Ligand binder design. Structure first.
Ligand SMILES: COc1ccc(NC(=O)Nc2ccncc2)cc1
Length: 171
């Protein structure tokens, strides 16, 4: 069976229990933690591309009030459908399964300033989602995994000083 497992889930849950935050900027900002997954049950002989996108978790935005994240208004129009193509794409199942698949280079932005960056809206919650696309397939078969442990709010600046401190402590 195809299995995609989250690497460093215990790390992710340390941020998740504070409510996790990722900085978005004009020129784009790498994530911490980095999304990494382990893969078993691909055809080692076949070729596949790895794609990553970020799904809006809620029909509302968030605000940090008295040290607490709370619903903070009605959402902004959905961010334009940005997909990050893993730079190893396309590759053999053997390649993707031999070591963890890391999205270390993905950049999160609040401006449509190109550069393969992902456009997010500040104060909105997103869930990372990975797609495995089989190359040369007339059925264009795609499998999609979501990672609820990796949920975060996009911010132009950190709200929770504990998050600001965790980020320094573990990075
Ligand atoms: C809850 O206690 C934990 C403490 C540490 C981790 N993992 C961790 O820090 N990983 C890491 C890897 C490489 N560079 C920096 C950090 C998980 C749980």
């Amino acid at each position: 069976e195809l299995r995609v497992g989250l690497e460093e889930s215990e790390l992710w849950l340390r941020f998740k229990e504070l409510t996790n935050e990722m900085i978005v900027t004009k020129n784009g900002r790498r994530m911490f933690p980095v999304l990494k997954v382990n893969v078993s049950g691909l055809d080692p002989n076949a070729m596949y591309s790895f794609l990553l996108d970020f799904v809006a978790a809620d029909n509302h935005r968030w605000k940090y009030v008295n040290g607490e994240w709370v619903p903070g208004g009605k959402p902004e129009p959905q961010a334009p459908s940005c997909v990050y193509i893993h730079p190893d794409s396309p590759n053999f199942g053997a390649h993707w399964m031999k070591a963890p698949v890391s999205f270390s280079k993905v950049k999160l932005t609040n401006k449509l300033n190109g550069g393969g960056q992902i456009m997010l809206n500040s104060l909105h919650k997103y869930e990372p989602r990975i797609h495995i696309v089989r190359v040369g397939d007339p059925q264009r078969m795609i499998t999609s995994h979501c990672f609820p442990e990796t949920q975060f709010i996009a911010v132009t600046a950190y709200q929770n000083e504990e998050i600001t401190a965790l980020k320094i402590k573990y990075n």
